[PDB]
Amino acid sequence: MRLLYLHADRFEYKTVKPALKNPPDPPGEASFGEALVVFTTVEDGDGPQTVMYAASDIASHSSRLKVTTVILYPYAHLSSRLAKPMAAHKRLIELEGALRTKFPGHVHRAPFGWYKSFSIACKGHPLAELSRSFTE
Amino acid sequence: MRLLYLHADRFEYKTVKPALKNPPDPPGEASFGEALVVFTTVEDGDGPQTVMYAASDIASHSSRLKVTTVILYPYAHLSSRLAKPMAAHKRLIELEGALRTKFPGHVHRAPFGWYKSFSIACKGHPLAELSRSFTE
Ligand SMILES: C[C@@H](O)[C@H](N)C(=O)N[C@H]1[C@@H](O)[C@H](n2cnc3c(N)ncnc32)O[C@@H]1CO
Numbered sequence: 210m211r212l213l214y215l216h217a218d219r220f221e222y223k224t225v226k227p228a229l230k231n232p233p234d235p236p237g238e239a240s241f242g243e244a245l246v247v248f249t250t251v252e253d254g255d256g257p258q259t260v261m262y263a264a265s266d267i268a269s270h271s272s273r274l275k276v277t278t279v280i281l282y283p284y285a286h287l288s289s290r291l292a293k294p295m296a297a298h299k300r301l302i303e304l305e306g307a308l309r310t311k312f313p314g315h316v317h318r319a320p321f322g323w324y325k326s327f328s329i330a331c332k333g334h335p336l337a338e339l340s341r342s343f344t345e
Numbered sequence: 346m347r348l349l350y351l352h353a354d355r356f357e358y359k360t361v362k363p364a365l366k367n368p369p370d371p372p373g374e375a376s377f378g379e380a381l382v383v384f385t386t387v388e389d390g391d392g393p394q395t396v397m398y399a400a401s402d403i404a405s406h407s408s409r410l411k412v413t414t415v416i417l418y419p420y421a422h423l424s425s426r427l428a429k430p431m432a433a434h435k436r437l438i439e440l441e442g443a444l445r446t447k448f449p450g451h452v453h454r455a456p457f458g459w460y461k462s463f464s465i466a467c468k469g470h471p472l473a474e475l476s477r478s479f480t481e
Pocket residue numbers: 228229249250251252283284285286291292293294297320321322323324325326469474
């Protein structure tokens with residue numbers, strides 16, 4: 210699993226065309242104020258262990274940033290070893306679920322399988338953009 | 346070399362704290378309308394061949410998008426095999442130079458070695474976000 214952590218003043222997205230034949234989540238749009246935006250790429254081999262490490266890391270990073278909103282934003286582009294779409298969707302659902310058992314704020318998982326427009330205002334402090342790898 | 350291509354309606358950045366002991370480019374800020382924003386991570390081993398492939402690809406992608414502005418935005422987070430900062434800065438300078446010999450529009454290379462805030466409005470069409478790897 211490969212993640213990009215973006216500490217944002219605001220974030221918004223909107224689904225547009227389907228990027229998969231039958232996207233497993235419905236279309237939609239949402240916008241947020243200050244949030245940790247987590248671009249999430251599921252890699253071949255990612256399992257329950259990986260999900261658990263990622264969830265713990267997101268929770269502790271969110272806590273140090275003092276954010277109360279986390280966006281789990283599915284992203285195809287952070288790896289050249291992608292999990293298949295069925296497995297990836299499963300892992301992202303598991304990730305959202307696991308995060309709620311460790312983090313008390315708003316957790317929003319963006320729809321999987323869509324092209325999306327997005328806008329972000331990313332903060333410029335030293336911890337505002339980080340990347341993480343998790344494996345098992 | 347690893348690149349992320351973001352077709353944006355607008356982009357802006359501002360340097361904040363230094364991310365390196367002595368950043369080799371001066372601090373600054375800039376903002377743009379519609380542009381191809383290229384997040385650029387230089388990898389260990391990237392040489393003139395890599396620069397040339399990347400430059401050609403950016404030029405042809407920019408042409409299909411019909412954009413007339415390209416932002417070369419140094420980014421540490423797209424690889425786990427980073428080039429050292431001296432080599433990386435050199436390669437990004439070479440990349441900007443090479444791009445101008447292939448692309449007729451505005452080429453803006455953001456300062457290397459700084460933490461930056463940024464804001465982007467990324468388009469949602471199927472070709473709006475792509476990743477590329479170049480090697481030699
Ligand atoms: C394109 C851009 O605007 C959008 N943001 C996009 O990247 N969409 C991806 C993910 O939503 C999802 N997807 C498929 N496989 C994976 C995977 N292994 N990991 C994460 N997501 C995946 O399926 C889409 C196309 O494969």
